Design a protein around this ligand. Structure first.
Ligand SMILES: CCCCCCCC/C=C\CCCCCCCC(=O)OC[C@H](COP(=O)(O)OCC[N+](C)(C)C)OC(=O)CCCCCCC/C=C\CCCCCCCC
Ligand SMILES: CCCCCCCC/C=C\CCCCCCCC(=O)OC[C@H](COP(=O)(O)OCC[N+](C)(C)C)OC(=O)CCCCCCC/C=C\CCCCCCCC
Ligand SMILES: CCCCCCCC/C=C\CCCCCCCC(=O)OC[C@H](COP(=O)(O)OCC[N+](C)(C)C)OC(=O)CCCCCCC/C=C\CCCCCCCC
Ligand SMILES: CCCCCCCCCCCCCCCCCC(=O)OC[C@H](COP(=O)(O)OC[C@H](N)C(=O)O)OC(=O)CCCCCCCCCCCCCCCCC
Ligand SMILES: CC(C)CCC[C@@H](C)[C@H]1CC[C@H]2[C@@H]3CC=C4C[C@@H](OC(=O)CCC(=O)O)CC[C@]4(C)[C@H]3CC[C@]12C
Ligand SMILES: CC(C)CCC[C@@H](C)[C@H]1CC[C@H]2[C@@H]3CC=C4C[C@@H](OC(=O)CCC(=O)O)CC[C@]4(C)[C@H]3CC[C@]12C
Ligand SMILES: CCCCCCCCCCCCCCCCCCOC[C@@H](O)COP(=O)(O)OCC[N+](C)(C)C
Ligand SMILES: CCCCCCCCCCCCCCCCCCOC[C@@H](O)COP(=O)(O)OCC[N+](C)(C)C
Ligand SMILES: CCCCCCCCCCCCCCCCCCOC[C@@H](O)COP(=O)(O)OCC[N+](C)(C)C
Ligand SMILES: CCCCCCCCCCCCCCCCCCOC[C@@H](O)COP(=O)(O)OCC[N+](C)(C)C
Ligand SMILES: Nc1nnc(-c2cccc(Cl)c2Cl)c(N)n1
Ligand SMILES: *[C@@H]1O[C@H](CO)[C@@H](O)[C@H](O)[C@H]1NC(C)=O
Ligand SMILES: *[C@@H]1O[C@H](CO)[C@@H](O)[C@H](O)[C@H]1NC(C)=O
Ligand SMILES: *[C@@H]1O[C@H](CO)[C@@H](O)[C@H](O)[C@H]1NC(C)=O
Lengths: 119, 1273, 173
């Protein structure tokens, strides 16, 4: 299971950030079986906050720290699971993690993005 | 003259300059014996010390006008260089140039390059390499670039002739180096790694002798153009026929009758994705990946009750087995022609369409699958014989001496060799007495016997080494061989199974006194002797293909593994690593390429897998067939040169038997001497009239008709005869009348001929035996003993009644005479095969005796994982708890030598070998549960056996049989041995059609418009236009597919009608132009017939699809369109000759097929008699069994090609519970039990496949070969 | 395997008789649970009357004077997947002549599917006092004998004619 994510993503304050998380699993993405776990952590050792997931439909938990600024921007049927984010605040700087499981695959992938807010 | 060795100097350059000036003012052939890469002519003698590896004058006077020079190498080889400065910068008189020339000409340079390439080919065989191999690949790139640099410095890059780029292999070297540097700096990784395999092809360049072999192979492949064109055309025609007949038929499935929630077939099919979901709506057999196929006809497959047949879903085998499109039909027809897993397609098509469609498969198998392969073999054979003839023509153009002498007297006596040969035979027979359930005392006696035998051989070795010194002992290859065997035996005694089987090679010492067993040694030695380069090229090609397949598809096989295996584990055959890639390539060469190609496609794409597999098939089979034919022709032709007299120094065995017979004569004479000292005119007319009646055509015809009727009455005794009581009674009384008729005929022949004339005749003996069996059966039935054991068993011999037609039919009697003549050589080669296979059988017993047992779940047939139930004791402990557990064994295994023979036969024929190989590689030990691929490298045993037995043993078999046929033909006086005297006249008249000169041209008519049309129609432009129109019509017929729109169907119909109009118009033009001269040409009247058939077929199909409902009749009638595309033969001279060869070989093939049909009929009757009630397992199912004459003939035609005979024999090997039920009750019959007879089944199937091999392969090859030479002549 | 043989149609008075009813499945590898019921319409009557039922290896005879103590099971034994559903009359009388029906109730067990089907087989039984010979057997024997005699007569005629011709030619020579 191969997951392609940028190690560092630098965006300007007040701009929109698209978090590129992609994979190349051999089997077709069965929406009845696909599992997504998007988590955010302020640091590598910090705990992860569960905020976005796919079980059967894109479900956004709408955390207070993200408000209504988090939506889905990829497509599982074409192997893009990217997450968009409007008007990136300086507080949005941190580490974003995408975890993907795509049955009947056995290996479980993990993509990590460090989002940086520029002045 | 040796003074011509002058150095290349400035005066030489000035002379070349003045000569080029004269050449410019001027505004032949170079010497072949002086050409570069060869040795100097012997006239030049030895090289003086001062001129080796130095610029010399061009020794060829041809190049006296050009700036070219010669550098001579130690070892007497000549390299032709260029005197033009390299790169326009470095003159030939330069230190760099001289050093580079010396380096290039040195042999250590070539040795280093060969070692480098062979080392890199080892690192190529790593699926994932360690991180430190980057340094090694950098070292390899550095060595390669240094070699290329020294070549460029020595001979210039691309400046004039004799430069670096002028050699085609230097192109490959340059491409390799640029690819390496590009992938190192600029950077698909898999494609670059697959390009790294190109560094293996440099073995051809650096190893001497391989370049010529590759060139010869390419020249041979240039000779197959006509055969390839004909093969493609025939496959296209058969694919179009199959597309017309079976389009969409493999999408039939059994669908549920009762549906809930208002759901319909479309609604269900729009939601299902998984096989578990499909299994709830379609009927699947247990442990199957595809839904059961059904049919709408009476003879097709039957759905269960509550299921109905419908055309929906996907085709079987991942969707790859179908006739839905021309491409898939072409793939299926290529598979049929190569006969690779063709029985599965046979059974699938029969189940889906009907059993009357076996005619298509009969025609295909006996017209393409055999004739095209034999044509390919014949053409390659002639290419090799022309190459060999050209090669031959060019070649033509104090106290110790007492003991020494005493032991020389003792051990060199001829009787000693006879005693040693007897000991060898006894030791082999003693080793062949090993089985799995062997008691301790038997093991002890075997060990003691083997110890005694190795002691005897060692004592003989010591006696022979003290009789003469080692300097004379070690001078003979036989003594070296025996020395190796004895020392290995001693090593094993001091210390395995393998070393125990090593002593078995001593059986080859009988080759001295066995002329036929020496042929096997000659073939094997040639394979690594004269043809060692061909074998090496084959090995290099196989290595390259294995590496390429691994590099391309190994990662895919591991990522997409759940697409091809339910457990998400790698299958048995994959390409994830080098050994399994090589196994796949070797299996393809064996001839199994479709089952692995399906998984290849599933994981890594149709285009890539198809390209790679087709390349492997074509190139590997070309090289393997070339090696096979080279071995055959070399060993059976070049060995016949009368080198040495027949045993000039008589062998010790011959001297021993001569002394033995002399002593026998002496003893007989002495004993005879000792015992003698101690002590009516009307009867002749009766015989004459009996002879007149018997020898009459009316009598012969009546008896032949009776034979046919009595033979045909045997086919009605199905298992369904209890429903036909009138037919039963009629057939009983018919049996009585037939017995009376034949008894009367035999009495008449007795009185007509005389007892001596009758009984010195094999045909009369056969008739007498058959009528005696019939009379005994009739008498026993009359006396009431109709069920007395052996008397009841004697009734199955009624299947031999058809054997009375061999003497009646001249074509069958003609073929049987050839078989009888060839019998002795068949026995010889069969004995050699048995002796050779005994070694492998004993080795297989020693390796796998008793290790094929396993503990299975009977419900699923799945082996328990060895973590639980690791041995048979735990298997029994689990059986005491569960109820569906069993400690099972393979039915065909290596438990003794007898069963090892059957295992070896199944492996050598490639039918059922995979089960044995899986068991062998899983085997752990005795009373131990097998583990998956625990003994992985047991595949090497089967690879080595397949090579040595199946390839060399088949080479020997074919060589001996064709030699016997040639000797028979020479004995007859150059007369065809497969044709009757009446057929010879037809053949002679028919042979004259290939040499008639063109007749006078048709005169122009009188009418002006008629003459103008004549000039229009007699034109090459007209002929070419007609040919391209035929090609376009063929394309429009190829375009048509399954599920096409009604619009496309209508436009295709209109296009075809337009083509019909065009061809009819051209026929009318030719008719009105040529008047009545048109019908004087066979091709012209063939075109006329085709035009009429096309018009009639179109009208009839339109009628049958409008005023009638009959899709099958419509499909069959629509086959008349193939006539419009069969006309491409007219303008194709290359394939017309091959078709004429086929037409020339038809009369003998007819007789061969007649005999084959008689044998198949007899075997079918025997099969219905014996195996009609065996359990439905493996290859015996509801549709392919021995319950009916039609079913039996279908199965027998299937196994005539040796396909699925393992799967048909497997249900018959059951003889005891819980495999079978001896007291099973069959409703509607009095027969009890569903068990088989293992001995009868083994004899039946082995004998049938041997007969099929001896007829349908060997006579087919001989007939096709001779008639292809004739058609070619 | 299973072959659907039809029953005989003539039973002799005072002896034993077996009434055949074989019903095979379309596919022999499928599982089923089968039971049967036999009805009987005596000649001279118009109504079919149930006489027995067999299920789960127990035969249940209805209270019928004509068949009490005369019918035993003669079909497939030891299983619930009945394919031979024959009965056996141990003492034939004149009350056993009429039309019989063999109702077969088969319940196939498929994957997530059960099919409850039914078959009916009709057997007409006529009782006699003496067992008649088969017309097919009679005509077959007659034709075999006439064929034997015709062939022998033809051969003897040809032998006599050829012998006389050969003797005449020889004595002329
Ligand atoms: C020296 C060198 C010698 C070798 C040179 C190369 C030789 C051959 C190249 C063969 C490959 C060409 C086509 C590449 C693949 C391709 O482009 O495939 C296009 C279509 C795809 O069809 P689909 O979408 O229905 O596939 C899915 C069907 N599903 C869903 C039921 C599974 O392929 C089809 O239809 C059928 C594809 C296969 C056609 C049969 C080829 C048989 C060739 C025999 C060699 C004879 C000598
Ligand atoms: C180019 C070559 C083409 C074809 C080559 C040959 C093809 C294969 C042909 C033959 C296969 C033989 C298969 C026989 C299977 C043996 C089964 C078996 O289990 O062994 C049966 C009998 C021995 O009796 P038993 O095992 O019941 O005794 C047990 C004693 N108790 C009960 C005290 C333990 O074995 C025997 O007949 C001895 C062995 C079988 C008899 C024939 C000898 C072997 C080869 C002959 C082929 C000739 C052509
Ligand atoms: C499913 C698809 C079905 C498609 C059916 C398409 C229509 C098929 C029609 C069947 C054949 C129709 C009749 C053909 C007669 C040919 C003929 O007239 O052939 C004559 C020659 C001997 O000709 P000649 O030397 O007397 O002079 C005249 C010839 N000339 C001047 C070139 C030396 O015999 C020969 O070659 C005879 C060669 C016969 C070869 C088999 C033909 C059928 C295949
Ligand atoms: C797989 C088969 C697929 C279909 C193949 C084509 C079937 C139709 C064949 C033509 C039918 C009409 C024939 C009309 C007369 C043809 C004719 O002249 O026959 C004779 C010709 C001879 O040709 P050639 O160039 O002289 O031969 C080489 C020199 N020697 O030789 C021929 O053209 C005779 C060929 C006969 C057909 C092949 C045998 C069929 C059995
Ligand atoms: C040269 C070729 C033609 C073979 C010549 C004969 C012998 C070299 C071999 C071939 C087959 C062998 C036989 C094959 C099988 C058996 C059965 C085996 O006994 C069993 O089957 C034991 C089974 C049990 O104990 O349960 C004893 C050896 C024997 C007779 C073998 C004895 C030696 C034979 C005759
Ligand atoms: C030329 C003649 C004399 C022999 C022709 C056959 C050989 C190619 C065979 C016979 C013995 C075989 C060997 C016998 C034993 C083994 C051990 C086997 O491994 C095991 O048994 C399991 C080891 C483990 O995992 O612990 C792997 C194959 C190998 C090397 C075999 C390789 C192939 C051999 C050499
Ligand atoms: C050259 C040698 C030729 C030998 C020929 C021997 C006799 C060859 C006789 O061939 C025809 C029979 O085989 C037909 O047998 P069937 O059982 O198919 O016939 C009845 C079919 N129905 C009606 C039950 C469906
Ligand atoms: C289980 C039982 C199995 C029994 C198998 C029996 C196989 C029999 C095969 C057929 C065997 C029938 O005999 C073959 C004949 O060839 C032998 O006689 P010839 O043809 O050599 O006689 C001379 C002929 N000319 C030269 C005068 C014309
Ligand atoms: C394997 C292929 C098997 C089928 C082959 C079919 C060939 C069908 C074509 O046969 C062509 C004929 O010339 C040979 O058959 P005949 O022997 O009938 O010809 C001579 C006529 N006499 C001798 C009978 C009087
Ligand atoms: C030598 C060439 C290869 C062997 C050819 C043998 C002759 C050809 C032998 O063909 C047998 C088939 O016809 C049997 O399948 P059928 O569908 O015809 O059976 C119909 C049965 N019912 C429905 C009528 C009862
Ligand atoms: N090596 C090998 N040799 N011969 C055969 C063979 C056997 C019987 C019939 C046929 Cl037609 C073949 Cl080709 C085979 N299946 N495999
Ligand atoms: C078909 O649909 C109707 C409602 O439209 C429903 O009442 C009915 O139960 C359905 N059919 C069955 C037999 O389930
Ligand atoms: C086998 O099973 C029976 C019944 O459960 C049990 O009584 C007996 O002890 C078992 N015997 C062995 C040898 O396991
Ligand atoms: C049938 O029953 C009658 C009356 O009981 C008896 O006379 C006759 O012998 C019986 N037949 C048989 C076959 O027992």
């Amino acid at each position: 299971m191969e997951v392609t994510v940028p190690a560092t993503l630098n965006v300007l304050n007040g701009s929109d950030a698209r978090l590129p998380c992609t994979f190349n699993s051999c089997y077709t993405v069965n929406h009845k079986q696909f599992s997504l776990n998007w988590t955010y952590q302020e640091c590598n050792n910090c705990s992860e906050e569960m905020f976005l997931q796919f079980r059967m439909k894109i479900i956004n938990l709408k955390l207070e720290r993200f408000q209504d600024r988090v939506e889905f921007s990829g497509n599982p049927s074409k192997y893009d699971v990217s997450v968009m984010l409007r008007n990136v605040q300086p507080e949005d700087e941190g580490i974003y993690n995408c975890y993907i499981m795509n049955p009947p695959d056995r290996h479980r992938g993990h993509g990590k993005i460090h989002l940086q807010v520029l002045m | 003259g040796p003074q011509s060795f002058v150095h290349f100097t400035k005066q030489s350059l000035a002379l070349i300059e003045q000569r080029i000036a004269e050449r410019k003012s001027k505004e032949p052939k170079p010497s072949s014996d002086l050409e570069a890469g060869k040795q100097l002519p012997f006239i030049y003698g030895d090289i003086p010390p001062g001129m080796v590896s130095e610029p010399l004058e061009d020794l060829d006077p041809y190049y006296a006008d050009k700036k070219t020079f010669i550098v001579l190498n130690k070892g007497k080889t000549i390299f032709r260089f260029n005197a033009t400065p390299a790169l326009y910068m470095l003159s030939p008189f330069s230190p760099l140039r001289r050093i580079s020339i010396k380096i290039l000409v040195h042999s250590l340079f070539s040795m280093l390059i060969m070692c480098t390439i062979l080392t890199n080919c080892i690192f190529m065989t790593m699926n994932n390499p360690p991180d430190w191999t980057k340094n090694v690949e950098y070292t390899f790139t550095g060595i390669y670039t240094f070699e290329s640099l020294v070549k460029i410095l020595a001979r210039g890059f691309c400046v004039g002739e004799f430069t670096f780029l002028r050699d085609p292999w230097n192109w490959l070297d340059f491409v390799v180096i640029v690819f390496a540097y590009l992938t190192e700096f600029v950077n698909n990784v898999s494609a670059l790694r697959t390009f790294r395999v190109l560094r293996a092809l440099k073995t051809i360049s650096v190893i001497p002798g391989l370049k010529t072999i590759v060139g010869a192979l390419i020249q041979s492949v240039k000779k197959l153009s006509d055969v390839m064109i004909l093969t493609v055309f025939c496959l296209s025609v058969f694919a179009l026929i199959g597309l017309q007949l079976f389009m969409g038929n493999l999408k039939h499935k059994c669908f549920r009758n009762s549906l809930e929630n208002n759901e319909t077939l479309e609604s269900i099919m729009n939601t299902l994705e998984s096989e578990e979901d499909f299994r709830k709506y379609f009927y699947y057999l247990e442990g199957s990946k595809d839904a059961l196929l059904c049919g709408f006809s009476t003879d097709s497959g039957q759905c269960p009750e509550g299921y109905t047949c419908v055309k929906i879903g996907r085709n079987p085998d991942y969707g790859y087995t179908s006739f839905d499109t021309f491409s898939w039909a072409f793939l299926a027809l290529f598979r049929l022609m190569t006969q690779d897993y063709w029985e599965n397609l046979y059974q699938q098509t029969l189940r889906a369409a009907g059993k009357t469609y076996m005619i298509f498969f009969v025609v295909v198998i006996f017209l393409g699958s055999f004739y095209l392969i034999n044509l390919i073999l014949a053409v390659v054979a002639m290419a090799y014989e022309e190459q060999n003839q050209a090669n031959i023509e060019e070649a033509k153009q104090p106290y110790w001496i007492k003991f020494k002498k005493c032991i020389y007297f003792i051990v060199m006596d001829p009787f000693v060799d006879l005693a040693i040969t007897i000991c060898i035979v006894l030791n082999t027979l003693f080793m062949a007495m090993e089985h799995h359930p062997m008691t301790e005392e038997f093991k002890n006696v075997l060990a003691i016997g083997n110890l005694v035998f190795t002691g005897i051989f060692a004592a003989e070795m010591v006696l022979k080494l003290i009789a003469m010194d080692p300097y004379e002992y070690f001078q003979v290859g036989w003594n070296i061989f025996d020395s190796l065997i004895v020392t290995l035996s001693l090593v094993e005694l001091f210390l395995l199974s393998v070393l125990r089987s090593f002593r078995l090679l001593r059986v080859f010492k009988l080759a001295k006194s066995w002329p036929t067993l020496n042929m096997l040694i000659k073939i094997i030695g040639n394979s690594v002797g004269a043809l060692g380069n061909l074998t090496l090229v084959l090995a290099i090609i196989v290595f390259i293909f294995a590496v390429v397949g691994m590099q391309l598809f190994g990662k895919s096989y591991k990522e997409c593994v759940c697409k091809i295996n339910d457990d998400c584990t790698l299958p048995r055959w994959h390409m994830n690593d080098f050994f399994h890639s090589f196994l796949i390539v070797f299996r393809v060469l064996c001839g199994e390429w479709i089952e692995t190609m399906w998984d290849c496609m599933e994981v890594a794409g149709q285009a890539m897998c198809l390209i790679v597999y087709m390349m492997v098939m074509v190139i590997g089979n070309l090289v393997v067939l070339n090696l096979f034919l080279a071995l055959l022709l070399s060993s059976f032709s070049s060995d016949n040169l009368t080198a040495i007299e027949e045993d000039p120094d008589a062998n010790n065995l011959q001297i021993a038997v001569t002394r033995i017979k002399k002593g026998i004569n002496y003893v007989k004479q002495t004993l005879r001497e000792f015992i003698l000292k101690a002590f009516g005119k009307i009867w002749w007319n009766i015989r004459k009239t009996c002879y007149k009646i018997v020898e009459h055509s009316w009598f012969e015809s009546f008896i032949v008709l009776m034979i046919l009727l009595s033979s045909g009455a045997l086919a009605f005794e199905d298992i369904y005869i209890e429903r036909k009581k009138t037919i039963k009674i009629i057939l009983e009384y018919a049996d009585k009348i037939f017995t009376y008729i034949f008894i009367l005929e035999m009495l008449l022949k007795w009185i007509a001929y005389g007892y001596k004339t009758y009984f010195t005749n094999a045909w009369c003996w056969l008739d007498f035996l058959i009528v005696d069996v019939s009379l005994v059966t009739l008498v026993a039935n009359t006396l009431g003993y109709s069920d007395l054991g052996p008397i009841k068993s004697l009734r199955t011999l009624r299947a031999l009644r058809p054997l009375r037609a061999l003497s009646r039919f001249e074509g069958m009697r003609v073929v049987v005479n050839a078989l009888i003549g060839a019998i002795p050589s068949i026995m010889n080669v069969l004995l050699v095969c048995l002796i050779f296979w005994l070694i492998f059988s004993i080795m297989g017993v020693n390796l796998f005796a008793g290790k094929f047992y396993e503990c299975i779940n009977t419900t699923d047939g799945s082996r328990f994982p060895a973590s639980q139930v690791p041995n048979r004791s735990e298997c029994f402990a689990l059986m005491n708890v569960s109820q569906n557990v069993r400690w099972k064994n393979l039915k065909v295994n290596f438990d003794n030598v007898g069963l090892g023979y059957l295992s070896l036969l199944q492996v050598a024929t490639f039918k059922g070998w995979t089960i044995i190989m899986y068991a062998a590689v899983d085997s752990v030990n005795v009373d131990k549960q097998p583990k998956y691929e625990y003994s992985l490298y047991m595949y090497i045993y089967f690879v080595v056996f397949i090579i040595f037995g199946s390839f060399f043993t088949l080479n020997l078999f074919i060589g001996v049989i064709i030699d016997n046929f040639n000797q028979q033909k020479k004995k007859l006086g150059g007369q065809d041995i497969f044709m009757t005297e009446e057929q010879k006249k037809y053949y002679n008249a028919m042979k004259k059609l290939g040499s008639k000169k063109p007749q006078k041209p048709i005169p122009r008519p009188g009418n002006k418009i008629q003459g103008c049309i004549f000039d229009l129609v007699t034109n090459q432009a007209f002929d070419i236009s007609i040919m391209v129109l035929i090609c376009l019509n063929m394309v429009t017929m190829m375009v048509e597919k399954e599920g096409q729109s009604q619009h496309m169907t209508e436009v295709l119909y209109w296009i075809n009608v337009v083509f019909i109009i065009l061809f009819t118009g051209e026929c009318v033009l030719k008719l009105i132009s040529l008047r009545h001269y048109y019908f004087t040409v066979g091709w012209n009247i063939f075109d006329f017939v085709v035009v009429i058939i096309s018009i009639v077929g179109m009208f009839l199909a339109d009628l049958i699809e409008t005023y009638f409902v009959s899709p099958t009749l419509f499909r069959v009638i629509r086959l008349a369109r193939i006539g419009r595309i069969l006309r491409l033969v007219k303008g194709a001279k290359g394939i017309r000759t091959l078709l004429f060869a086929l037409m020339m070989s038809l009369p003998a093939l007819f007789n061969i097929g007649l005999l084959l049909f008689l044998v198949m009929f007899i075997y079918a009757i025997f099969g219905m008699s014996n195996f009609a009630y065996v359990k439905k397992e493996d290859g015996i199912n509801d549709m392919f069994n021995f319950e009916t004459f039609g079913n039996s003939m279908i199965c027998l035609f299937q196994i005539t090609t040796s396909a699925g005979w393992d799967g048909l024999l497997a249900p018959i090997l059951n003889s005891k519970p819980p495999d079978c039920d001896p007291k099973k009750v069959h409703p509607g019959s009095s027969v009890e039990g569903d068990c088989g007879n293992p001995s009868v089944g083994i004899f039946y199937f082995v004998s049938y496949i041997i007969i099929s091999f001896l007829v349908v392969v060997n006579m087919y090859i001989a007939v096709i070969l001779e008639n292809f030479s004739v058609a070619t002549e | 395997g299973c072959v659907e043989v039809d029953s005989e149609t003539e039973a002799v008075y005072g002896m034993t008789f077996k009434i055949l009813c074989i019903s095979c499945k379309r596919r022999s590898e499928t599982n089923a649970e089968t039971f049967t019921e036999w009805t009987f319409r005596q000649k001279g009557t118009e109504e079919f009357v149930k006489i027995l039922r067999y299920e789960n290896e127990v035969l249940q005879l209805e209270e019928d004077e004509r068949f009490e103590g005369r019918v035993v099971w003669n079909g497939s034994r030891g299983t619930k997947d009945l394919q031979d559903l024959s009965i056996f009359i141990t003492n034939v009388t004149y009350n056993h002549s009429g039309d019989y029906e063999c109702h077969v109730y088969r319940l196939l067990f498929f994957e997530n599917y059960e099919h409850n089907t039914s078959v009916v087989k009709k057997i007409h039984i006529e009782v006699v006092d003496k067992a008649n010979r088969d017309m097919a057997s009679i005509v077959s024997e007659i034709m075999m004998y006439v064929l034997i005699v015709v062939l022998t007569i033809w051969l003897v005629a040809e032998m006599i004619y050829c012998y006389k011709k050969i003797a005449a030619a020889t004595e002329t020579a």
